[PDB]
Design a binder for this molecule. Sequence first.
Ligand SMILES: *CCC(=O)N1CN(C(=O)CC*)CN(C(=O)CC*)C1
Ligand SMILES: [Zn+2]
Lengths: 596, 17
Amino acid sequence: STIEEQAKTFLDKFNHEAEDLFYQSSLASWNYNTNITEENVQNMNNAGDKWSAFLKEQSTLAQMYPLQEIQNLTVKLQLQALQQNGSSVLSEDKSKRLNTILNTMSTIYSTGKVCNPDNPQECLLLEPGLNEIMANSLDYNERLWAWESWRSEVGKQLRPLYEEYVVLKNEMARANHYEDYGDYWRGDYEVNGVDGYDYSRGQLIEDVEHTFEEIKPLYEHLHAYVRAKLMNAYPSYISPIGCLPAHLLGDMWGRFWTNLYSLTVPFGQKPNIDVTDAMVDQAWDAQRIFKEAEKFFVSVGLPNMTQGFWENSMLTDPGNVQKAVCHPTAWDLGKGDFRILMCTKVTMDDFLTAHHEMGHIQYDMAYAAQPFLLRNGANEGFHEAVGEIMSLSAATPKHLKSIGLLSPDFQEDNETEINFLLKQALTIVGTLPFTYMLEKWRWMVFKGEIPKDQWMKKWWEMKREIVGVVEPVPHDETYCDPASLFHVSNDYSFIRYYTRTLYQFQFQEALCQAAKHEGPLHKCDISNSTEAGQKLFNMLRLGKSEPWTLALENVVGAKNMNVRPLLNYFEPLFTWLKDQNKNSFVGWSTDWSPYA
Amino acid sequence: ACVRSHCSSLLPRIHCA
Ligand SMILES: *CCC(=O)N1CN(C(=O)CC*)CN(C(=O)CC*)C1
Ligand SMILES: [Zn+2]
């Protein structure tokens, strides 16, 4: 009879096959990633192409059911998911070409290596080769060699391709009536038609910039402090009023400044909270690390891990008899099947990473209660923020002492409080200007506010002005230094790292109140608050069934992202940096460079 | 862009298809 009848018929049939095809695909993908063979590549390709085929066909047939005529909102939301997605209006000739550019760019990223000017035929890759240098090297010219070689040998091969990427990507974005592809990406945060919870694409830029401006005072003092310290470790090479050289920031691009901790540590004479040696003295293994994460989630009232998680998961590296992809990854295969893949080492880092990865499992498990197409995080920043807050509580001295990785007589003091906040800021606050700047550059290129003959000109201006970070060597339009980062060459949004950063502190403040924490926020462990897990579960559970603005509001009592919680976390450090930097220069010449 | 993600990570375009 009715059209909303035919729609439910249509969905019930799509969901049945999709639940099966999605699993046959995620299962093959898991096999490959755990055991890299030609046959597993083949199954994964074959199973990839069936789902894609299915989801294309279905998406088209979904248009027969226009949302206006659909009164049921669950059914509407599902039909919308399907109608929107599974759609490439880009012609099959060009799609083919773009699919190649993506592959070539991805290959060049993993494959490319810099063979040493000196060396006959010793060739470093980015991983682990150049990355070992760019983290651990304390030699200016060695870091500068790796930094430049990478950009001038690999980046210059990406420039031809990334120019063509922008053309085909912008065609694709405009065939869907989006202004440009940056606009499409901003569409992940778009709520339209939910009275009271709506959010537009241009609003994202507005809040990212407004929030960023409130963060500038803190990064300015972080930058001033770090620079004053890098003058001691690299005397002669850094101006006291200039940008930080790009090759001195503790990794290949300066995304994180984490590796500068040893150079910039406020009070080195104090103990380092690191518990890797207690983990080893107590003979912890991967099982233990993951059984301790499981206990953390049970303490807030979330479920245990499934039987199948312990049977099907790979929690350690399987040796030389088997080739696994050792990037920590949480999996939601479907049909009640959840697995983590991780080459766990008996380390504090992996301990905390385990909590991050199992947090995604709890998220995926929660929203299994949702219909298939609504089984996703509320926005590209939610899953990462869910990960990060688990790690925030587990890293605290309170929790480590509770699990016995820290002696009951550890002396957490003001200095101990400041060292922690500094190391945290070097990782969290340090990536905020780098993340904002990078996506800004990309937004602008996609928009057309940047001509190809100024791409690198604008990149380094923008780096200097926003990030306070100058190239050590002049780079022409033969370079594509943006694409020298994984996500740029591999076609992925980067604003998710900015949004997830505010979200995560917004979530922690709310869960720490729900848990009724006394002191400063950085010393908060939601470990035994069922009220904290209750509040959290009610958002996890929604998946993508509600607007991200209501999802967020459930947890935090506000409908947009907000920087007060993040700034309240680093307040003690912020007031410490200001007292420290009072005989140093705060601010940067955007013109001083090391090649001046 | 999506519909249903099976693994939390951003895998390289070459081998995730
Ligand atoms: C919704 C699409 C999806 O599940 N993802 C796959 N994906 C790509 O299309 C790149 C090959 C990126 N995603 C992941 O990396 C999941 C592990 C999300
Ligand atoms: Zn994660």
